[PDB]
Amino acid sequence: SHEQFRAALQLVVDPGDPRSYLDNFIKIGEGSTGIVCIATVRSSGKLVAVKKMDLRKQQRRELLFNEVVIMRDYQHENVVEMYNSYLVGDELWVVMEFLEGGALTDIVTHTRMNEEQIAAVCLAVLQALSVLHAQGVIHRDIKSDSILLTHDGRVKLSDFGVCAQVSKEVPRRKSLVGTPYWMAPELISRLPYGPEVDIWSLGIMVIEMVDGEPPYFNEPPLKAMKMIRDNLPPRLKNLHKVSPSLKGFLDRLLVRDPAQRATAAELLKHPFLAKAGPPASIVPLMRQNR
Amino acid sequence: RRRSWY
């Protein structure tokens, strides 16, 4: 069965072993699907990133195909590029672009962001989502950990391992997927749902960017979901600290009724994004410049 | 906790 699944991935991944052209694997992170390493291209001296995912360790092994779908079919300025995929033993390896500036999480938990920086992040994320949504792709795990940065402050969406596609034949998804504090109310309620869930999740990430934390972070995951599902939309812990342009923006995102939530494409026209600075504005936030 | 369900 595991062997059965190895054989399936083999048919779909590139041939060979990238250890044959990469040196100096160094682990830099974890997500839920597996680990992330930096490696050095032997011949160029360039750095690439390598996602290793043990087949035996996935809740739903079939989601591993999501990584292949995206590589093959959706590549874009605000999405991390995947180069090649391989089966190495019991692991799937994706060689991809290295975002040397790290995750938004490290910023949000160690400095404060002004509204220029917040708005630049949102603009970059929405450009990614409006295109993905336009083709029936829902990321389903929008949060600061999934947002990665170049050294020069460009912002790219990452970690597609739990995404899904909708379309006319499958207008809606139903699976319980995501990270609790960020999950939309209708998805916690087990209603069929569409791209609207990325928009809610993005709102939570706006609150991360403002308060440093998503709401009900001091509650265990299951209590948080109940309150997400049962309560009025979560509030900023510090409302006096967002301009009413930011408060208005957020009010389009944290909407309980999924039919009234703004879509990515509408949100691109929101005045709050007028404040977005260039990537260079994000650069001072990174660990190496603080 | 920052970990995700699937």
Numbering used by the authors:
A (entry chain A): 300 to 589
B (entry chain B): -3 to 2
Publication passage describing the model:
As previously observed for WT PAK4 in the absence of bound peptide (Eswaran et al., 2007; Ha et al., 2012), in each of the structures PAK4 is observed in the active state conformation with the activation loop phosphorylated on residue Ser474.
The phosphoacceptor Thr appears poised for phosphate transfer, and thus the combination of Val at the DFG+1 position and Thr at the phosphoacceptor site seems to be highly accommodative to positioning an active-like conformation for the phosphoacceptor hydroxyl. In striking contrast, the cocrystal structure of PAK4F461V in complex with PAKtide-S displays an unexpected conformation of the phosphoacceptor Ser residue. Although the overall peptide conformation is similar, the phosphoacceptor Ser is rotated about its α-β bond (χ1) such that the hydroxyl group is pointed away from the active site. Additionally, two alternate conformations are observed for the DFG+1 Val residue. Despite having similar catalytic parameters to the WT kinase in vitro on peptide substrates, PAK4F461V expression did not detectably induce WT BAD phosphorylation in cells above the background level.
